[PDB]
């Protein structure tokens, strides 16, 4: 609605401090601002955004914002060059997608090793001595095993990588979920559960209740969890993650960002809120007092927060890890690794079979979500030499082991296809996108009577 601001923030982040900023914003301008924290908002936001009854400002890590920008759900920002100097250029690079600068960077988040001084005096420097430490404590460590963000630093410790980054450009064809280091890293996590050092059904909520009650010696969490552990009065410490095979753990670096809905008529009010009220020491100190943000992007406030040992330990783990890509293909990568880690913890599939499926699903399967009623442009890149002289096709796979029904084929209703044979780019145009059009399509190259898969495409349709 015109004249109002709706903000969505994560249930694990501090919305009480942000609500205090809303009272200061409402006091000076007279605009009521409502902060909400719906569950699974990272999946719920795109469904409701384009409709109109969506939030004006969304808070989430920067890896999800690239799929939003490609779908046209977020407006380009023009923070006056003077204002950009207030934030660190490193944080601005995280929120840059095709030069758009879609979102405002707020805070930098990174996992840390949190251990209780009651249960453990000196934390282990290596992963390998945790099984022996758990035998003496019998627990040694409890952390979320349902989200791959928490278990990735062990997988990435031995050289595992998501998408190769060569000269500022990510190579979507070089995915490393089944490399030599990931197989050794994931096996260690499974062996911890097989040896009854961890449980396969442990989630985030269990770890918060267990560690804050002095039941486990260590946990793995971000800065947002410090406020609830301080309330438990347990003397906890924040330190560097243990090394694996002599190599440091590489946690994925997250940048808390605020995006403005493209359909919201309150962009100016939101921009005036984000620039003049959110990104100040006054606004962030109120939010930081609710739930810690970590390493903030504002230089003036970061100079004070960095003196805190909890924030300094977060930077130590952040410097050992790499920043998350903001490309749209990251969403399919996270779900594939999430499903693979869960199967290995339960023992239903081996580590080799779990990572083999996750690598395949993460390779050339970019999820596309377009707004209903508008056009959706998919670009299937392919080798122009290997497939030279071959016609292309665009078909819908009906089953997991079923046939692919040829919607259109190159040299149909609301689907048009064009082939750039010189540049190696196949483009399919969907006009007036509607529901039921979602259905895991495939880009194919025809030779004789056989067809090779160029890139499986998972289309999703927003409610609009």
């Amino acid at each position, epitope marked *: 609605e015109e004249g109002k601001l709706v903000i969505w923030i994560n249930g694990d982040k501090g919305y009480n401090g942000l609500a205090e900023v809303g009272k200061k914003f409402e006091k000076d301008t007279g605009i009521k601002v409502t902060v909400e924290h719906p569950d699974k908002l990272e999946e719920k936001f795109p469904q409701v955004a384009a409709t109109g009854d969506g939030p004006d400002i969304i808070f989430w890590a920067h890896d999800r914002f690239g799929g939003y920008a490609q779908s046209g759900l977020l407006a380009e920002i023009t923070p006056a060059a003077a204002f950009q100097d207030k934030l660190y250029p490193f944080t601005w690079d995280a929120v840059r997608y095709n030069g758009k600068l879609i979102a405002y960077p707020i805070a930098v988040e990174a996992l840390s090793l949190i251990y209780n001084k009651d249960l453990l005096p000196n934390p282990p420097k290596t992963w390998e001595e945790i099984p022996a430490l758990d035998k003496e404590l019998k627990s040694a460590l409890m952390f979320n095993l349902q989200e791959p963000y928490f278990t990735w630093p062990l997988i990435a410790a031995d050289g595992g990588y998501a998408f190769k980054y060569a000269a500022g450009k990510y190579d979507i064809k070089d995915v490393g979920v089944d490399n030599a280091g990931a197989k050794a890293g994931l096996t260690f996590l499974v062996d911890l559960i097989k040896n009854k050092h961890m449980n396969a059904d442990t989630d985030y909520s269990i770890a918060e209740h267990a560690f804050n009650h002095g039941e486990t010696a260590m946990t793995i969490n971000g800065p947002w969890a410090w406020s609830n552990i301080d309330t438990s009065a347990v003397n906890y410490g924040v330190t560097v993650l243990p090394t694996f095979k002599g190599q440091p753990s590489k946690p994925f670096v997250g940048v808390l960002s605020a995006g403005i809905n493209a359909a919201s008529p309150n962009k100016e009010l939101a921009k005036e809120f984000l620039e003049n009220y959110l990104l100040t020491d006054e606004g962030l100190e109120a939010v930081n007092k609710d739930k810690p943000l970590g390493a903030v992007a504002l230089k003036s406030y970061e100079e004070e927060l960095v003196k805190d040992p909890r924030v300094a330990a977060t930077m130590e783990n952040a410097q050992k890890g790499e920043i998350m890509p903001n490309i749209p293909q990251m969403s399919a990568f996270w*779900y594939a690794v999430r499903t693979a880690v869960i*199967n290995a913890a339960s023992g*239903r*599939q081996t580590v080799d079979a779990a990572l083999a499926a996750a690598q395949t699903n993460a390779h050339d399967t970019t999820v596309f979500q377009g707004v209903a009623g508008q056009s959706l442009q998919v670009s299937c890149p392919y080798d122009s030499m290997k497939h030279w002289g071959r016609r292309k096709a665009w078909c819908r796979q009906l089953g*997991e082991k079923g046939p692919c029904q040829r919607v259109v084929s190159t040299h149909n209703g609301s689907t048009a296809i064009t082939d750039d044979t010189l540049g190696g780019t196949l483009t399919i145009t969907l006009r007036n996108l509607q*529901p*039921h059009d*979602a*259905g*895991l399509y495939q880009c194919q190259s025809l030779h004789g009577s056989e067809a090779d898969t160029l890139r499986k495409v998972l289309v999703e349709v927003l409610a609009d």
Partner: antibody
Amino acid sequence: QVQLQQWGAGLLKPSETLSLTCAVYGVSFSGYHWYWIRQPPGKGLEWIGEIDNKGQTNYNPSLKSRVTISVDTSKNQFSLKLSSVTAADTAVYYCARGGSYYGHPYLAAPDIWGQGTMVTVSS
Amino acid sequence: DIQMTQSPSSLSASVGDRVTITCRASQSISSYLNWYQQKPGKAPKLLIYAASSLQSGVPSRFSGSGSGTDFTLTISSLQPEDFATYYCQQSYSTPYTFGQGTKLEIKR
């Protein structure tokens, strides 16, 4: 070419936990919606919960405090669990699949149904 | 949760009659209402999806109409096997609630 067959405890006592399993033959759980729907004797249908093609679970808010739906892909079975069963839970329970294959959830209306299992809860 | 209201609760008609059954939603569900036919002792069978698209194999005498809040299922020429209880289902909401149902009987 694809059918669902159900089995489980048909007789329960109050305060116990209901456990029903529904076996799927011919297709994996990926790509479709999978529903649990119950029908009390002489009453209409009641939606218990669903799972999405991505494994996301959604429950009826009136039953969210007592429902747990899980899937075992190794046996291609998916189960319905009722924590604090009460006499009001006497019903025929149906498992059903949505027929989109990675389509939109609007058209994922249950088109393939199991035979259902009569569950009677009484002291 | 969206409330679904069917009318009439029970209806009797002869073979060949043209029958209409109404389903009203408590709020706008766009055009995503589904119709089912349930005979005694059997599992429900999907007839209409997305308000007007008939599932493959259902007789052409079944037809659906409506949008937003008011929807209608129509049997153009009633047949002896069509007599059963019919249910409407919305697919717009997060919980997928059903209507009270409409018992179809034979006049005598």
